[PDB]
Symmetry: D2
Subunit: 429 residues, 4 copies
């Protein structure tokens, strides 16, 4: 007696995509195949692609609207960033205060990341105990010594370090320099964050992490040259992974200029030539996962010139459909690879054993996608606190019809959000 | 209902080994999971590991041979072409072969065409028949025939498989040894040095790249050899490679004590080399393990090492010996074992129905009993000639069942329960 | 005191070219500097560049030529020491007997000095020690050619003898077949000839030889590299620490396929002359110090063998007399290469690679071998200026911006632009131990 | 007539060493060879090696004392460091004052280095105009922005940047850590400055210099791993050179433990196995020059444990003889290579056209060395302000007999310092 059965969809399995049925029980995938039998309920995925359901390894979060946007965007598990939050997630005390405040607002599931900061190097073991899945840092921030000592510690606890990689110093200087000269266009901003500032940062961190004996994950890589640094170190046998985001694949500096401060983000959006290289890296399997790096903010902060506007891209709701359209539909990527880049790889890298793949025993988390079905994103579609996004006015070639988490539909393109917040925090041991 | 359900076994799935059930219908995997229902026949695999049947990409052959394969846990073999009298080099060549094999296949068999110096014009023929690749030796082809042939294959969307050894240098060093009276196993190995393999691989890698042809490097014997393939792959070239159990479980000292039965072309090198190979295998630099089964009449195996015909009769020992050595002795995960013994080969050669325990694939399995030993004896062998360098070896795991397309074709208890039901596999 | 003093010239020393005087005594450089004293004879080189005489590491003397004519062509071209190839002449230089015969024949015919190379062939791997004993400075082979085993075994022995192996690197089989394929299709064009000798045939060959020689433990010298991809292999191998050097020739720097198509069979040679883009690459490699020396690979030929279409024609460039001035013009004048670099590439590097201790260096104690070059002074090469047995060359008709005015060998002027050849032949064979 | 002729010496020429005479006129080498004729004076160098005077590209100065020690040590040209001086050589005024303060004190010639500090990247042109031969900087120190900004300017001026490459931060933290746990041993000190702190810094600087478009010279390399980093970069086509010092070739950590604080220096003296690798690097031409990094100090600051004592090696007077003995005599290095490592390469790298080479038209700067003639270094032999050195007690197998600058003997092992100081500053253009 299965609780649910999803029939006739083109299901994305690890090796291939094929039409098979999925049986669900207790919120977990009970079986996969044909003539599964009877279930309390049945769903018809005919004409739909049933994907595992994004695992956004780079999410900044309020919980109610954000998680809401996530589900709508086909995201069933997010990995919450530690800093950029009221109390910074740096130890048990701080994270438990965060849990309490979130009680009942989670529409999707959430794994957690601890923050590696200049002052909690001796409390790292606390968040490891709690069940965090990794630690984030910027090289607030830590110096080379604190990074080395913190990484050495993380390596011993069996935790990976996640790093934002840019020489902030040279960037801020070039930026201010651009201020004094009156060059505040999207192109001036981008040039104040040249590729070498990313590459030098990546090289520094790769080396120190290696000597510290710590596994490393390079966040949002914006250039092929940055990707190349990650690949060469991996071929040397070092334990590292990297990720990028939809905006580095679907946007370029010219469009950034046209769009405005809404397309402004830390690692900047480079020119089309850079983008073509990124696409080559992606298809070559050199970028482990795609993440949103969703960074929302009050519109009052996105006001002013590019140079003084707050950086960050609000696109948590647009990752799955845009990438399915651009990657699979537009560029012909295989469906299984799409599943890997949006969910499986992140799940494996961060040890979310129950997530990221449609396989027996895993959580029944899915996203139903309607290929060849366009629409133009508009402000009123967004579920964000503030209905603004650099993707508004964009033609998206596919649609998310259903989003299922642990066996229940939490988002339906026709009935909206059918149930009460069903999400839970995920803590690993 | 399902024709069969295999219950409670530790199943080797794609990224994980799991205790789940497998339902089969019409020689196909119908479903995987729990609470599958019922079937005509039910098998309890409790305590057993259920692996995808081995896909041996390097087999030299049918009655005896396919029976040994089945008993060894091999459900699909990829048959070599330059062994048979009429060599598989064209349509009429392979057609004759199909007819003569009539009713002798105990397991399924994919096919390779031969790329020889005189058939570069007929390659498309075998391509049309449906072989999954072409084998060649650099009967043998010169650099020109190889470049010319590879270029054609690359256009046909076919990979070239290559025996990579500088034969000239190997032959001369051996002849040299004959002269000096050096004829032990150690002299034989020293007459087939690592550089003869490396030079050959480097040469073939470059020409295949220029020709625009996909390449698979056969039986690599040294980490140095593997290192060349890895370098090329990182440069973006489409190359894969294989090795054999004899390069991981035997070393020169054992070859010396065993005799001519452990004498093979790229030679079994010393223990240090072996350690390097295990390092490469665990690092995932060797795509698959293959038998390179090459039997022969004992008369040709008599004489000193230098004299003896080279070849390892080990088609029946590939699966259990590697499971024991890799998984039991060295801790390899079950999923990786499955990839190296079956999945990678299927993906490399496009055998979409094989090497994967997944929905819709052929129901080909081998049941392995972990921590259960026996000593391989001549009696146990299904080969035409009951000899093998593995005879007398203590193996810590046993094959209890082999299933091909839903049917048990080998049972540790019954032997061969059904008439040969294997089929040739031709891909289009 | 001194026998000769060359005054006021711009002398190419090892690290700089500068106006300084040179004193000579007993065929050797006695001193270098200012106010050297006086000499039996004084030459005024004001306005001229005084360079070390070229050391041609790749010379073929006859398939028609001979010591008399080729050696005079060399002197007129500014070459004072040639390193003779072994497998061209009829009695191939493969052992004691064959070289001694060669010597007896060349008696009194040498206008310039000549070091010697032995040949590594399939049947003399056992005799190699003989030429080493005589004193050749290296062994040449084509991979009568040697198969991979013969090359490996021979290089191993040479490495034991402390002798370098020089190799013509081209996958001949593929080249021949591709050539026969252009033939069948009626494609006998220069551009077609070049295409039947694609870059990968040179790269595959260099790769194979580099590896085998490394395993044989033998020092290697790659002959006439025609493409930057070929040079890149050598550089990579040297950066891995392998003992190897390589050379190229002026035809791969001053001619391209289009000019080759215009010139005809006289511009046909084994590694083919690639296109202009390939040439650009070669200049970059040369200026970057990745090509150790420039050599002629002078390969004279009877006019009957150069007749007909490009595929049928005998390959080989006759340019022994044009290496120095052409390259001085192209490299130093047109491209700005420093004079000392020019000296290294045309003389010093070859001398060092082959252990010619008395040559290619204008420094105290070395042989007084010089060539006087008149810069920014052009002339047009004509068949009549050629000293070869057969007066033809793809460089005929070329306007060269510098001229060789004098060539001095061991203290004596052997070629003078106003007088011709002043003295009877006095070159000697150079045998090293 | 020639003013002087040195006869019968084994002269180190560029290509080889041989017995030839050297003619001098007006302080310049007038000629080289045999039968040079007559001169006002004639020196017999029979049985001696005549080497070009050493060009020490890294010395810290006072002038009267340091210069005498230099001359007695066989050094004829030094390249003076800018920082860590009374006023710092960072601009016109600073160096101008320098010249006047040194008047009449120079026993040997001195080319000059300017400092690249945080407060003068806009004055760099001043020292370039005066004729400095390069600029030294650390990591006052400059941050990544100041380093990049200044190197960019230096590159435009055609000036090389010289850098002390160690991750200062991490070394200081590991050090404090040691003298917190009670580890104040020489072996503890070296461990507090691990090889990775030098590799990281070298990697950072190489890359930034590369992007800034500035020629770079890596100061006192202490490990083969560091040299390998420089070698890689050069093989990639970057204009980079590097140096090391005798103490990294002639001393190891055990000997340092034995000697005490006199052998304590910034990049630390590594273990014997590391020294082996260094010799290997030196022999295959991966290290352009050998410099002294002479750094004397009051013996007061050398009291106490290794952890709190001042770092610096007083060995200006012992570079030539110790290296001649170790490299050539003990290890079989050819004389022409010895000359390049001790003089020619430095001269070429820093444009000292008249120095480092025995060739026509160059300054008549030489040092006469008596091979296989030993002695034990004594405090008394030292000409330093403070007669102390980690080389005291050392058996040195060759001796400096005479030092000649611009044709005049300024040091004689039997007469001492015969002439009044005749050294001059060298400013290039
Ligand atoms: Fe960030
Ligand atoms: Fe972020
Ligand atoms: Fe084989
Ligand atoms: Fe085989
Ligand atoms: Fe040739
Ligand atoms: Fe030739
Ligand atoms: Fe320093
Ligand atoms: Fe210093």
């Amino acid at each position: 007696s299965f609780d649910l059965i999803i029939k006739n969809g083109t299901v994305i399995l690890e090796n291939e995509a094929r039409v098979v049925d999925i049986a669900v029980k207790g919120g977990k995938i009970a079986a996969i195949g044909q003539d599964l039998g009877d279930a309390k309920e049945v769903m018809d995925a005919s004409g739909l692609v049933v994907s595992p359901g994004m695992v956004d390894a780079h999410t900044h979060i309020g919980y109610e609207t954000g998680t809401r946007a996530a589900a709508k965007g086909g995201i069933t598990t997010m990995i919450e960033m530690p800093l950029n939050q009221l109390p910074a997630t740096v130890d048990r005390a701080s994270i438990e205060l965060k849990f309490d405040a979130a009680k009942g607002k989670l529409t999707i599931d959430a794994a957690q990341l601890g923050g590696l900061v200049s002052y909690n190097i001796d409390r790292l073991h606390e968040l490891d105990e709690v069940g965090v899945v990794g630690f984030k840092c910027f090289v607030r921030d830590v110096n080379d010594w604190q990074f080395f000592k913190g990484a050495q510690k993380l390596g011993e606890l069996g935790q990976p370090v996640l790093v934002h990689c840019e020489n902030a110093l040279i960037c801020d200087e070039l930026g201010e320099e651009a201020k004094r000269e009156g060059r505040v266009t999207a192109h001036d901003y981008v040039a104040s964050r040249p590729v070498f500032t990313e590459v030098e940062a990546i090289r520094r961190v790769l080396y120190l992490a290696k000597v510290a004996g710590c596994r490393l994950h390079v966040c949002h890589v914006s250039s092929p040259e940055g990707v190349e640094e990650v690949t060469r170190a991996r071929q040397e046998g070092q334990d590292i992974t990297c990720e990028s985001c939809p905006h580095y694949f679907v946007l370029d500096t010219d469009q950034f200029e046209e769009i405005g401060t809404l397309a402004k983000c830390s690692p900047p959006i480079r020119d089309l030539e850079n983008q073509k290289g990124m696409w080559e890296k992606l298809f070559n399997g050199e970028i482990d996962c795609l993440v949103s790096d969703h960074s929302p903010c009050p519109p009052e902060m996105k006001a002013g010139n590019i140079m003084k506007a707050w950086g960050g891209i609000a696109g948590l709701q647009s990752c799955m459909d845009v990438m399915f359209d651009e990657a699979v539909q537009k560029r012909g990527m295989s469906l299984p690879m799409f599943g890997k880049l949006m969910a499986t790889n992140a799940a494996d890298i961060f040890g979310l054993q129950q997530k990221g793949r449609i396989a027996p025993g895993k959580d029944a988390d899915f996203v139903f996608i309607q290929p060849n079905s366009s629409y133009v994103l508009t402000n009123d579609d967004l579920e964000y606190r503030h209905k603004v996004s650099p993707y508004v006015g964009r033609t998206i070639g596919a649609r998310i019809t259903k989003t299922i988490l642990r066996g229940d539909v939490i988002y339906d393109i026709e009935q909206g959000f059918p149930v009460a917040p069903k999400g839970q925090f995920i803590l690993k041991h």
